[PDB]
Amino acid sequence: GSFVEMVDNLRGKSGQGYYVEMTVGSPPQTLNILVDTGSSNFAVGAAPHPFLHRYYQRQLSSTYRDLRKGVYVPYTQGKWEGELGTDLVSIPHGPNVTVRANIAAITESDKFFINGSNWEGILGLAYAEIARPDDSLEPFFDSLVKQTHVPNLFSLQLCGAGFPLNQSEVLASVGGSMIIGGIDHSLYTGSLWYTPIRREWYYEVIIVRVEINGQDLKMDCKEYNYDKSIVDSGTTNLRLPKKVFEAAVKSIKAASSTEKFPDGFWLGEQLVCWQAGTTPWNIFPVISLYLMGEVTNQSFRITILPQQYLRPVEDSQDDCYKFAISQSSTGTVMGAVIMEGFYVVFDRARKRIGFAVSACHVHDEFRTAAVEGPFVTLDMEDCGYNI
């Protein structure tokens, strides 16, 4: 329905992440927490760091409980180490409840805290299977549902500004909404279409067809989900498996061939700039991803514009962007630049993910993002990867 207390509770941008305010401990300690559907731990800075202006001070919380257990989390681009404990946690612009949750108090980290991101921790919203050190460490959302009457569902509206925001603007701007326990109908237009959650670990989905400006990429659909396809608010880009990325970039280059861009642009490293207001959106194609539907032999599609996959960056008065589609060796990742086009419903109770056109997606007068269906699609189970 309508969840006015949670609408507009996020801040941030696709490159540095979107965060929500939370409180930990007694008396409450306020922290800004990255919303991450790609992990399953609630972890906060708990020791001084050059990039943190605040951190969780366990010795100041009367409700802190030490679990006497460490946690070591090395991942591809970064790492953190911490100490496990529990404490009382609330979301000020959330459900009006306080829960006793696991907290990994980060004591040492490497390339984890981003200089100027304004967040001091991460809220992993995925399932216990991928929690560290193991699946016995109950994730925050699991604790919230178990301890309260909050429905087992959350929804995210990530709002890209469509232009760069400076330090002051990003602190003053509304970055979106995280609706805990419901769906807010003001955040989207048109209908919600649902795709099954294939397995509960990451938010895993199955892509069944890919088009670039209506042209079928024509790859065996297993390639699109090799070795998985996930929905991840903690990733900036749309990341595609190597072979899919190679085919997609060739097609996007062919569609936009009236302008030549350097190799560094297509590699997502180099910015491209145009005179203020002259970005040639129309030369860039739309991209549609078809997802397995809830009905047998039915699919639907989500369509994004270059306003989603060209990420605004500061250079001058030029309008500059980076290409936000990149290669992956760990499957497809529908990151923030996909999520900015849509209101995304993580319906854990019904093991499904819903998509609708976002009320805050960036577009022009000629084209809009879309969520459409149904389409007849056969052998969709064959699109999923095994082993």
Q: How far is the CB of 82 from ligand 60U (least distance, A)?
A: 10
Contacting residue, 73, 106, 249, 339, with ligand 60U by CB under 6 A: 73
Q: How far is the CB of 373 from ligand 60U (least distance, A)?
A: 28
Q: Phi and psi at residue 250, in whole multiples of 5°?
A: -60, -45
**Which residues is 179 bridged to in the sheet?**
155
In the complex with ligand 60U, the residue whose CB is nearer, 81 or 294, is 81
Catalytic residue among 87, 142, 232, 319, which?
232
Q: Are 357 and 303 in contact (CB under 8 A)?
A: no
Choices 160-168, 227-235, 276-284, 358-366 (CB under 6 A): range interacting with ligand 60U: 227-235
Contacting residue, 6, 9, 11, 17, with ligand 60U by CB under 6 A: 17
Q: Are 39 and 126 in contact (CB under 8 A)?
A: yes
In the complex with ligand 60U, the residue whose CB is nearer, 77 or 317, is 77
Is 235 a binding residue for ligand 60U by CB under 6 A? The answer is yes
Active site residue 232: yes
* Sheet strand arrangement including 310-313: 272-274, 319-323, 310-313
Specify burial of residue 350 (Cβ count, 10 A radius: 0-12, 13-18, 19+): middle
Q: How far is the CB of 39 from ligand 60U (least distance, A)?
A: 4
Q: What is the DSSP letter of 15?
A: T
Is 75 a binding residue for ligand 60U by CB under 6 A? The answer is yes
CA gap 324, 326 in Å, rounded? 6
**Which residues is 127 bridged to in the sheet?**
none
Is 77 a binding residue for ligand 60U by CB under 6 A? The answer is yes
In the complex with ligand 60U, the residue whose CB is nearer, 138 or 294, is 138
Q: How far is the CB of 285 from ligand 60U (least distance, A)?
A: 26
Q: How far is the CB of 313 from ligand 60U (least distance, A)?
A: 16
Concatenated DSSP letters of 98-151: -EEEEEEEEEEEES-SPTT----EEEE-S-GGG-SS-TTS--HHHHHHHHS---
Specify burial of residue 278 (Cβ count, 10 A radius: 0-12, 13-18, 19+): exposed
In the complex with ligand 60U, the residue whose CB is nearer, 76 or 167, is 76
Active centre residues (catalytic): 36, 232
Which residues contribute to the site for ligand 60U (CB under 6 A)? 17, 34, 36, 38-39, 41, 73, 75-78, 122, 124, 130, 132, 232, 234-235
